[PDB]
């Protein structure tokens, strides 16, 4: 249910010291030595919530990598109260 496109052979090549204001939100191609890396962590992908009043598990919501997603309506008991993320039904992707 997910296909990632890996763009190869981008023509321009940048070094890390010449990245500037114009390269923000654009595709860059930089060479470098990997120095240190972190462990693989689970990042939310298809987030499912549950309501604390009725207990119903709400439908999957896509989590973009830019910022946290949040919901405020239950569609079952029609309330704006606290909703909780359950990791049992939430789908995750690898992050490093």
């Amino acid at each position: 249910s997910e296909i990632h496109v890996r763009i190869s052979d981008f023509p321009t090549i940048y070094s890390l010291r010449e990245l500037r204001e114009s390269n923000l939100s654009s595709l860059v191609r930089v060479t470098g030595v990997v120095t240190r890396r972190t462990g693989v962590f689970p990042q939310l992908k298809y987030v499912k919530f549950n309501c604390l009043k009725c207990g119903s598990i709400l439908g999957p919501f896509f989590q973009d990598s830019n910022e946290e997603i949040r919901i405020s309506f239950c569609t079952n008991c029609k309330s704006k109260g606290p909703f909780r993320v359950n990791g049992e039904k939430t789908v995750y992707r690898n992050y490093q």
């Binding site: 604390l52 009043k53 009725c54 207990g55 119903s56 309506f73 079952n76 909780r84 359950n86 039904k89």
Partner: protein, 213 residues
Amino acid sequence: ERVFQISFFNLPTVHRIRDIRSEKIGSLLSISGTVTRTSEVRPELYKASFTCDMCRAIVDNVEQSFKYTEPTFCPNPSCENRAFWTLNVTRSRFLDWQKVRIQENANEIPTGSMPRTLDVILRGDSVERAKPGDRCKFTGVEIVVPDVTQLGLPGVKPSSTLDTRGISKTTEGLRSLGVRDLTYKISFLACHVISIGSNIGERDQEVFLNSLS
């Protein structure tokens, strides 16, 4: 857009007010009765306009079907909730509306029973064609209207519960459901009103002489 109204008349059979049955609900029908009470002309919400509480953007041309409804689409993608709306009465569209009450004709009343009334509703150009104290034949549709007064009546009153079979739930903790009463009464929605003679069988002279053959 101009609102068009189709008026049917000259039906083969005119039924009594006591011939009204639930098998004809939502069907073209012709009744007759003596007008007793008329209301003033009132506006009825036809094409409502709603503003979303978070969008602050308006959507127009929403169909109103009898009881007051609010859309749940919210086509603008600004927010993610559907139930919250605010109604604007200034730029919404209405229709003429009159609730005229009719009674059973004195020759149609059975041997022991008292006459029974019916609230027939006129919209559009048929409004104010009924006058208190004449015998009128109404052609329209037998509709049904929610009724609260049937609370204490004997018999099993139908109720509507929300079906919860395919929803996933967890017993985490911190059980309420929405259930409605379906009690109704039969009403009439007339499109054509003709005033037959109150007898068994306009002051100017010229306007009267124009009518005769």
